[PDB]
């Protein structure tokens, strides 16, 4: 369990989970703790067996130092990065628009080498943004998240292709570093080995070898085993090292004069000197692993080396000849094979810590040049470490990252699940990555290496399809950035409790069995054949003694949002994807209600999302209030927790927190103390349990439209609160300052009634569309007040004000700023979208009075009607199964055991033999209720209040028509389904226009939700109009309604005057085109059918 306050949700699961779901936010917090070199991370690393681990900032400072004068007379070094406590709390930063940050300090040592003098000094490096306990950054009071970036790891990559000109098989290899020139080798269609250096022209590969100091005797000794290498050597017009170097230099430096020193040093600076070329630690690791070099030695350098180049060449030659095994002098034997680019053995996660580290590196590079200059422009006596350093480039780089980087994104605060998934999001598109414009299907496709590491279901459906995914629930990040997943060890056909986290490259070398495989006492497989996954991404029945590993859980492959879909395996992949996506866009409701049919994942997902308030240490409640809760621990110390009340989310949804504990209650460490926006008793609640009947109904649910009972509107079952935020700032101009004031010119006395003395609308005022919010005037004075936009309305819920007289820290040219918050409560209405967890989205087409809904013989009217014709074609019968189980969850059940356990119930745990009404159940996604169990439970449901069994064993009921009153001639499937209110509400999805603002540089209308823009008329619509032959309507659309100014004023006044719309004469476009043509000395003439005119 590991959650003291967990409600008792009985589970249908048969298999036990030998591993608990890890911290779902660890992907963010562990990476950031690595970046700042936290003590916890260091202890964890040395526990893992890492040798003297070094933090992210330490790495960059060790790379930066020592900074030295080019004369060698002085040195500057940086050490000991540490952080002071944060300036302000997270909520204070949110309130006052500050960044949540900690001062960073580094010990700087300056040395004068000519004298040998020492100076050491503590240098302030700037305020460094800090991650919150929730895995987010508060930047200018806005809560943001940094998404992990999927990128190809540096290393040596071999490839095989077909020569279209000859159909011959050609091989090639690319050495790809973190920074530096590229180095390619290839065997072409004429059986000769060549090299491309820095993407310049191709050369015989020996030209490089000679340039590196190899004589013909050495090349023959090393590569003599292959005839193509000897043919390349014997057909090369290069005598030795100097000639080869000069030939390389010519291609590398076209048009420049070649000399010995220039070429000799240039070839070294390309690949073998650190300041201009380096494989990252991961790149060195990958190269050593593939080429079998430096095995049994610590990774301590970044450059390419002579042995790497020679081994790459030999590997390419061996691969070309079809060999499978290769061992090099001083190395170890390794397989010979091409590399799949999309395999997570080659892709890696550039997480938050590394993303911040790179920008720190850039800023420190700028500061390094600053030091190089002002160290050589001052008296050696006066120079000190603090007077050599300018921190501004570093702070500017960090601010640039957190304010402009595509990977730094406003957190999706629609609901807790959306934020939790956003923190765990993996993005292949971004700086240094790929783009939506030209990313092919190859990178988008699911890969067999994704198993247990990246979710195959939860991905966007638009142009980001396949490019954005989610980390699997059991996956963690290898310190080199590779995703690794846990497996139970298996030996001699008996499973054992040792858990090993394997990367995809490691896993390909093993046989992994299916977790659901049966095992008897002490772990031996019952059956002699087992499903296993194999390196080809294949599945096979191997002998039970042929298994090396087993999956730890059936759902090892799914993400958090996918794990929350009951009966997942009964739903098609597309509809499961739709349901997972829709769960993230479900809006919070005024009252949250946990699903009757759920998974085991709701509780941990809600807890790890962090919207719920959790007690830090065991104690007893001292105080409870709508605003705060106070606890006294067994230590005797006291804690106070503050609840967010009616706070606006980034998306406008309400973030209200509520206390659940009573005064004097025992509260254990980790127990939930306050519910979040979409949680009930700690577990997530994104929707409502509705009584659903599966039938067509008078065509009002045609084509997936939904029929709702008016009860849901009356009882606010699906009501939600939304808060809008409006800004207005008083500034200054050349003609003077601007005033926020109640004394607006020429406005009626009542229109400014609700405004206060400063001119800001009072709290609690009901503001209509177009009404005043904040009065402001500016010189010319003019009316420039803030007014409620088109369609918007609500109650003024809050006011925030900033003035430079209070040191508000606003930008230049602003004297005051006012934010007005307007709260609106929206009931479910026609046109609003609803959806289940199975992708069964729909639009509410009709809301019926309670007496019109079809009702059960008990008298209960159904809440929702879903059309039959959707289920069979869309292949998501999991919604039907849930519905059945939903009823079995609302009405209790009791399996008779007097004579014995029924056969169908023989796999039920004794705790599931009976349960009372309204008892919640768990049916995990790949280990839950089977068909026979569900049918038996349907047969075993308790009767209703009056002693009547309302739903038969098949899940159907004899509904009555609420209008005519007679029963329907056949029983209808009835049950309980969990329904989500989606954020696609009608209130802002509707647009209308009849003239208005217009574009100026060209005179066509505007386009925008809040800008009163018109609809676009594309060329396809013009094609349709031409096909109709409706010439006059097309002319109206083309000229009067879009471009014409005079035509518009004339037609509007004609409509207003109630007179005939003038029939258009000479087009306005034609007259400008004619003069444009004439200006180029072209005689353009209008011709009549009878002659020139």
Partner 1 sequence: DVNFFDELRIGLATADDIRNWSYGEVKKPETINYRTLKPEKDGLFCEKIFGPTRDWECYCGKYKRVRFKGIICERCGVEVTRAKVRRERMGHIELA
Partner 2 sequence: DNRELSERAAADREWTYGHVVVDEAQELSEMDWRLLMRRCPRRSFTIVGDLAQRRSPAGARSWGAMLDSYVPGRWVYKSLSVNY
Partner 3 sequence: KRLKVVAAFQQSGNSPMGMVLDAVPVIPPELRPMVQLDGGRFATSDLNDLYRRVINRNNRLKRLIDLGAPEIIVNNEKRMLQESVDALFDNGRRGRPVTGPGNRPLKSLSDLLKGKQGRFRQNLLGKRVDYSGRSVIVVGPQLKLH
Positions touching partner 1 (CB under 8 A) are 1065-1066, 1071-1072, 1075, 1077-1079, 1081-1090, 1092-1093
Contact window for partner 3 (CB under 8 A) among 520-528, 695-703, 776-784, 936-944: 695-703
At 487 the three-state DSSP class reads: strand
Q: Which is nearer to partner 3, 415 or 701 (CB)?
A: 701
How far is it, in rounded angstroms, from Cα 590 to Cα 583? Answer: 17
CB of 219 to partner 2, least distance (A): 16
- Is residue 260 within the footprint of partner 2 (CB under 8 A)? no
Tokens representing 870 are 């959707």
Q: Phi first, then psi: what are they for 716, rounded to 5°?
A: 55, 40
Nearest residue to 863 via CA among 890, 839, 897: 890
Applying CB under 8 A, among 231, 331, 892, 1067 the residue interacting with partner 2 is: 231
Helix ranges, 759-810 (H): none
Residues from 584 through 613 that contact partner 3 (CB under 8 A): none
User: Among partner 2, partner 1, partner 3, none, what binds residue 1093 when CB lies within 5 to 8 Å by partner kind?
Assistant: partner 1
Tokens representing 769 are 């569309």
Tokens representing 535 are 């390196």
User: Among partner 2, partner 1, partner 3, none, what binds residue 843 when CB lies within 5 to 8 Å by partner kind?
Assistant: partner 3
User: Among partner 2, partner 1, partner 3, none, what binds residue 1090 when CB lies within 5 to 8 Å by partner kind?
Assistant: partner 1
CB of 1081 to partner 1, least distance (A): 5
DSSP state of 590: S
- Is residue 845 within the footprint of partner 3 (CB under 8 A)? yes
In terms of DSSP bridges, do strands 864-866 and 687-694 run parallel, antiparallel, or are they unpaired?
parallel
Q: Which is nearer to partner 1, 524 or 1071 (CB)?
A: 1071
Q: Which is nearer to partner 3, 233 or 1040 (CB)?
A: 1040
Cis peptide before 783 (omega within 30 of 0): no
Could you tell me which residues come within 8 angstroms of residue 1072 by beta carbon, excluding any fewer than 6 positions away?
Answer: none
Q: What is the DSSP string of 298-361?
A: -----S--HHHHHHHHHHHHHHHTT--EE--TTS--EE-----TTSTTTEEEE-HHHHHHHHHH
- Is residue 38 within the footprint of partner 2 (CB under 8 A)? no
Q: Which is nearer to partner 1, 71 or 1083 (CB)?
A: 1083
How far is it, in rounded angstroms, from Cα 999 to Cα 1011? Answer: 11
User: Among partner 2, partner 1, partner 3, none, what binds residue 831 when CB lies within 5 to 8 Å by partner kind?
Assistant: partner 3
In terms of DSSP bridges, do strands 687-694 and 972-981 run parallel, antiparallel, or are they unpaired?
antiparallel
CB 708 within 8 A of CB 863: yes
Applying CB under 8 A, among 115, 1015, 1033, 1045 the residue interacting with partner 3 is: 1015
Q: Which is nearer to partner 1, 898 or 1001 (CB)?
A: 1001
CB 434 within 8 A of CB 467: yes
- Is residue 1045 within the footprint of partner 2 (CB under 8 A)? no
Could you tell me which residues come within 8 angstroms of residue 767 by beta carbon, excluding any fewer than 6 positions away?
Answer: 754, 761, 773, 788, 793, 794, 795, 796, 822
Q: Which is nearer to partner 1, 361 or 1050 (CB)?
A: 1050
CB-CB neighbours of 441 under 10 Å: 8
User: Among partner 1, partner 3, partner 2, none, what binds residue 1088 when CB lies within 5 to 8 Å by partner kind?
Assistant: partner 1
Q: Which is nearer to partner 1, 237 or 1002 (CB)?
A: 1002
Cα 766 to Cα 792, 822, 823, 895, distances in angstroms = 11, 9, 10, 57
């017009």: which residue's tokens? 237
How far is it, in rounded angstroms, from Cα 356 to Cα 143? Answer: 17
CB of 320 to partner 2, least distance (A): 11
The 1023-1042 contact track toward partner 3, x by CB under 8 A, reads --------------xx--xx
Q: Which is nearer to partner 3, 540 or 1021 (CB)?
A: 1021
Could you tell me which residues come within 8 angstroms of residue 559 by beta carbon, excluding any fewer than 6 positions away?
Answer: 421, 424, 455, 457, 458, 470, 471, 472, 473, 580
- Is residue 1016 within the footprint of partner 3 (CB under 8 A)? yes
User: Among partner 2, partner 1, partner 3, none, what binds residue 1037 when CB lies within 5 to 8 Å by partner kind?
Assistant: partner 3
CB of 234 to partner 2, least distance (A): 9
- Is residue 1073 within the footprint of partner 3 (CB under 8 A)? yes
CB of 221 to partner 2, least distance (A): 14
# residues near partner 3 by CB under 8 A: 53
- Is residue 1006 within the footprint of partner 3 (CB under 8 A)? yes
Q: Which is nearer to partner 1, 735 or 1087 (CB)?
A: 1087
User: Among partner 3, partner 1, partner 2, none, what binds residue 996 when CB lies within 5 to 8 Å by partner kind?
Assistant: partner 3
Could you tell me which residues come within 8 angstroms of residue 620 by beta carbon, excluding any fewer than 6 positions away?
Answer: 631, 632, 664, 665, 666, 667
# residues near partner 2 by CB under 8 A: 8
Applying CB under 8 A, among 664, 699, 736, 916 the residue interacting with partner 3 is: 699
CB of 1054 to partner 1, least distance (A): 19
Task: State CA 651 to chain mean position distance.
Answer: 16
Nearest residue to 380 via CA among 41, 772, 721, 110: 110
Let me know the angle formed at the C-alpha of 232 by 230 and 236, rounded to the nearest 5 degrees: 120
CB of 989 to partner 3, least distance (A): 6
User: Among partner 1, partner 3, partner 2, none, what binds residue 845 when CB lies within 5 to 8 Å by partner kind?
Assistant: partner 3
How far is it, in rounded angstroms, from Cα 665 to Cα 672? Answer: 12
- Is residue 228 within the footprint of partner 2 (CB under 8 A)? yes
- Is residue 507 within the footprint of partner 3 (CB under 8 A)? no
CB of 1013 to partner 3, least distance (A): 6
- Is residue 670 within the footprint of partner 3 (CB under 8 A)? no
User: Among partner 3, partner 2, partner 1, none, what binds residue 227 when CB lies within 5 to 8 Å by partner kind?
Assistant: partner 2
Applying CB under 8 A, among 698, 714, 769, 851 the residue interacting with partner 3 is: 698
- Is residue 993 within the footprint of partner 3 (CB under 8 A)? yes
Contact window for partner 3 (CB under 8 A) among 457-465, 634-642, 802-810, 842-850: 842-850
Nearest residue to 160 via CA among 344, 342, 340, 346: 340
In terms of DSSP bridges, do strands 67-68 and 74-83 run parallel, antiparallel, or are they unpaired?
antiparallel
Contact window for partner 2 (CB under 8 A) among 224-232, 291-299, 522-530, 942-950: 224-232
> Residue 144's beta-bridge partner residues?
137, 410
- Is residue 830 within the footprint of partner 3 (CB under 8 A)? yes
- Is residue 702 within the footprint of partner 3 (CB under 8 A)? yes
CB 37 within 8 A of CB 57: yes
- Is residue 700 within the footprint of partner 3 (CB under 8 A)? yes
Applying CB under 8 A, among 115, 166, 496, 625 the residue interacting with partner 2 is: 166
Applying CB under 8 A, among 247, 458, 683, 1043 the residue interacting with partner 3 is: 1043
The 172-211 contact track toward partner 2, x by CB under 8 A, reads -----------------xxxx-------------------
Let me know the angle formed at the C-alpha of 708 by 703 and 713, rounded to the nearest 5 degrees: 145
How far is it, in rounded angstroms, from Cα 281 to Cα 56? Answer: 12
310-329 b/e with 16+ CB inside 10 Å = b? Answer: bbbbbbbbbbbeeeeebebe
Helix ranges, 567-714 (H): 573-584, 601-609, 710-714
| DSSP H or E stretch at residue 67 | strand 67-68
Q: Which chain residues interact with partner 3 by CB under 8 A?
A: 698-703, 705, 734, 830-831, 843-846, 986, 989-996, 1002, 1004-1007, 1013-1019, 1021, 1037-1038, 1041-1043, 1048, 1069, 1072-1073, 1075-1081, 1083
Q: Which chain residues interact with partner 2 by CB under 8 A?
A: 166, 189-192, 227-228, 231
């Amino acid at each position: 369990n590991s959650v003291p306050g967990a409600p008792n949700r009985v589970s249908f699961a048969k298999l036990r989970e030998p591993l608990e779901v890890p911290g779902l936010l660890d992907v963010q917090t562990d990476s950031f703790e690595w970046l700042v070199g936290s003590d916890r991370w260091r202890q964890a690393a040395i526990d893992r067996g890492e040798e003297n681990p070094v933090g992210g900032l330490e790495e960059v400072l060790a790379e930066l130092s020592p900074i030295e004068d080019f004369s060698g007379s002085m040195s500057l070094s940086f050490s000991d990065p540490r952080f002071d406590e944060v300036k302000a709390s997270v909520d204070e930063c949110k309130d006052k628009d500050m960044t949540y940050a900690a001062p960073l300090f580094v010990t700087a040592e300056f040395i004068n080498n000519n004298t040998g003098e020492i100076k050491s000094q503590t240098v302030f490096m700037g305020d460094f943004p800090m991650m919150t306990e929730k895995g987010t950054f508060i930047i200018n009071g806005t809560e943001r998240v940094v998404v992990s970036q999927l990128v190809r790891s540096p290393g040596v990559y071999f490839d095989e292709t077909i020569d279209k000109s000859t159909e011959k098989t050609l091989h090639s290899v690319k050495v790809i570093p973190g920074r530096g020139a590229w180095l390619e080798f290839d065997v072409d269609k004429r059986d000769t080995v060549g090299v491309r250096i820095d993407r310049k022209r191709r050369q015989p590969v020996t030209v490089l070898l000679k340039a590196l100091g190899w004589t013909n005797e050495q090349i023959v000794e090393r590569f003599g085993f292959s005839e193509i290498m000897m043919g390349t050597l014997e057909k090369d017009t290069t005598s030795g090292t100097d000639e080869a170097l000069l030939d390389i230099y010519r291609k590398l430096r076209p048009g420049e004069p070649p000399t010995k020193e220039s070429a000799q040093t240039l070839l070294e600076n390309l690949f073998f000197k650190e300041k201009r070329y380096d494989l990252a630690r991961v790149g060195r690791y990958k190269v050593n692993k593939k080429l079998g070099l430096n095995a049994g030695k610590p990774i301590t350098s970044s450059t390419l080396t002579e042995e790497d180049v020679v081994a790459t060449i030999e590997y390419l030659v061996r691969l070309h000849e079809g060999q499978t095994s290769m061992t090099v002098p001083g190395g170890v034997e390794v397989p010979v094979e091409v590399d799949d680019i999309d395999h997570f053995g080659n892709r890696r996660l550039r997480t938050v810590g590394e993303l911040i580290q790179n920008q720190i590196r850039v800023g420190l590079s700028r500061m390094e040049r600053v030091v190089r200059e002002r160290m050589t422009t001052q008296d050696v006596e006066a120079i000190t470490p603090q007077t050599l350093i300018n921190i501004r480039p570093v702070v500017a780089a960090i601010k640039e990252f957190f304010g402009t980087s595509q990977l730094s994104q406003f957190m999706d605060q629609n609901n807790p699940l959306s934020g939790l998934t956003h923190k765990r999001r993996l993005s292949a598109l971004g700086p240094g990555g790929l783009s939506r414009e030209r990313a092919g299907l190859e990178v988008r496709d699911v890969h067999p290496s994704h198993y247990g590491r990246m979710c195959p279901i939860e991905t966007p459906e638009g142009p980001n399809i396949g490019l954005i995914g989610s980390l699997s629930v059991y996956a963690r990040v290898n310190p080199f950035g590779f995703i690794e997943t846990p497996y139970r060890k298996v030996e001699n056909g008996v499973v054992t409790d040792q858990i090993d986290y394997l990367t995809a490259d490691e896993e390909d070398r093993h046989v992994v069995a299916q977790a659901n495989s049966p095992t008897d006492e002490n772990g031996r497989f019952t059956e002699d054949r087992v499903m296993v996954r194999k390196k080809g991404g294949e599945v096979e029945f191997v002998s039970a003694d042929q298994v090396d590993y087993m999956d730890v859980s059936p759902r090892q492959m799914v993400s958090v949002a996918t794990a929350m879909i009951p009966f997942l395996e009964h739903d098609d992949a597309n509809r499961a994807l739709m349901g997972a996506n829709m769960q993230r866009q479900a809006v919070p409701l005024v009252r949250s209600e946990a699903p009757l049919v759920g998974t085991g994942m709701e509780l941990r997902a809600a807890i790890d999302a962090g919207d719920v308030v959790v007690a830090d240490k065991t104690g007893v409640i001292e105080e409870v209030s709508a605003d705060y809760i106070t606890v006294m621990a067994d230590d005797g110390t006291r804690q106070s927790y503050r609840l967010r009340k009616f706070a606006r989310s980034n998306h406008g949804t309400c973030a209200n927190q509520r206390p659940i504990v009573d005064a004097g209650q025992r509260v254990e460490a980790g127990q939930v103390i306050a519910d979040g926006p979409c949680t009930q008793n700690g577990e997530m609640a994104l929707g409502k349990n509705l009584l659903v009947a599966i039938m067509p109904w008078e065509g009002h649910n045609y084509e997936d439209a939904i029929i709702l009972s008016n009860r849901l509107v009356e009882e606010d079952v699906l009501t939600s609160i939304h808060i809008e935020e409006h800004e207005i700032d008083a500034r200054d101009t050349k003609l003077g300052a601007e005033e926020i004031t109640r004394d607006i010119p020429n406005v009626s006395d009542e229109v400014l009634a609700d405004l206060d003395e400063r001119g800001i609308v009072r709290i609690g005022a009901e503001v209509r569309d177009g009404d005043i919010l904040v009065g402001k005037v500016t010189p010319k004075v003019r009316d420039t007040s803030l007014k409620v936009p088109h369609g918007e309305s609500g109650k003024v819920i809050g006011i925030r004000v900033f003035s430079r007289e209070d040191d508000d820290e606003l930008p230049a040219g602003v004297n005051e700023l006012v934010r007005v918050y307007v709260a609106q409560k929206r009931k479910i209405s026609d046109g609003d979208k609803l959806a289940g967890r199975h992708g069964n989205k729909g639009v509410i087409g009709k809301i019926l009075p309670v007496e019109d809904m079809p009702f059960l013989p008990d008298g209960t009217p159904v809440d929702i009607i879903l059309n039959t014709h959707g289920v069979p074609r869309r292949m998501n019968i999991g919604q039907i199964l849930e519905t059945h189980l939903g009823w079995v969850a609302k009405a209790g059940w009791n399996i008779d055991v007097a004579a014995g356990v029924p056969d169908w119930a023989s796999k039920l745990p004794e705790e599931l033999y009976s349960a009372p009404a309204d008892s919640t159940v768990a049916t995990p996604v790949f280990d839950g209720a089977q068909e026979g169990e569900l049918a038996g439970l349907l047969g075993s449901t308790l009767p209703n209040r009056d002693g009547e069994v309302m739903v038969d064993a098949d899940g159907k009921s004899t509904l009555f028509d609420g209008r005519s009153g007679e029963p329907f001639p056949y029983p209808v499937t009835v049950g309980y389904m969990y329904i989500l209110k989606l954020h696609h509400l009608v209130d802002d999805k509707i647009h209308a226009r009849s003239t208005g603002p217009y574009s100026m540089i060209t005179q066509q209308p505007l386009g925008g939700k809040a800008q009163f823009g018109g609809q676009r008329f594309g060329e396809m619509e013009c094609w349709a109009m031409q096909a109709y032959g409706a010439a006059y309507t097309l002319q109206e659309l083309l000229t009067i309604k879009s471009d014409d100014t005079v035509g518009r004023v004339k037609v509007y006044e004609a409509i207003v005057k109630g007179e005939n719309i003038p029939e258009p004469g000479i087009p306005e476009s034609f007259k400008v085109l004619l003069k444009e043509l004439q200006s180029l000395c072209l005689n353009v003439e209008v011709l009549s059918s009878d002659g020139a005119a």
